[PDB]
Structure formats: structure tokens, C-alpha cells
Amino acid sequence: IDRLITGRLQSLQTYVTQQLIRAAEIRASANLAATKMSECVLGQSKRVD
Amino acid sequence: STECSNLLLQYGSFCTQLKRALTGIAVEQDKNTQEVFAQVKQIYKTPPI
């Protein structure tokens, strides 16, 4: 049971680390979408592309 | 080593998901270079003067 708990805890820690990095990746795009909603929809943008 | 490979078969899918993560990073590098540089739609060449 020591071996099984160590293996399952390592797998769950790997899952949580991957979820944290993907959460940061999603949050960056969420901030970009908030900026695009605040500038493109609520006004006229002079920024090229 | 065949005995090591038979022992590593019992340890799960860490040995494959590390390859999956590194393949994702390797795809993302080419995506980054394409996004940064491949912005123009046509290859404009300079006049000879």
C-alpha cells in the first residue's frame, strides 16, 4: 500500500501541475479577450492588425 | 535492458505523457516562429535601385 499510495500521489501531483500550467495559459488568453472586448467592441482601435 | 523495460511497463503512462508534453512544446515553437514572422501574405522584393 506504501508503493501504491506513492505512485497514485505522484500521478495526481503531475495532473495538478499540468492543470496549473494550462490554467495560466487560459488566463493569458482570457486577459487578451477582455482587452479586445474593451477596445474593439467599446471603441475604435488605431492599432494595426 | 529487458528486465528494466519489463519493470518500466508497470509504472504507467508517465513515460508517454512526458513525450506528449515535449511534442506539444516542439509544435508550439514552430507555431511561435510562424506567428512572429509569417505575417505578410506575399513576398515583396525590393526594386534594383
Curated annotation (Swiss-Prot), chain A:
Domain of life: Viruses
Role: Subunit of the fusion protein that is processed upon entry into the host cell. Mediates fusion of the virion and cellular membranes by functioning as a class I viral fusion protein. Contains a viral fusion peptide that is unmasked after S2 cleavage. This cleavage can occur at the cell membrane by host TMPRSS2 or during endocytosis by host CSTL. In either case, this triggers an extensive and irreversible conformational change that leads to fusion of the viral envelope with the cellular cytoplasmic membrane, releasing viral genomic RNA into the host cell cytoplasm.
Name this polypeptide is given: Spike protein S2'
Originating gene: S
Shown chain mapped onto the complete sequence: 993 to 1041 of 1273
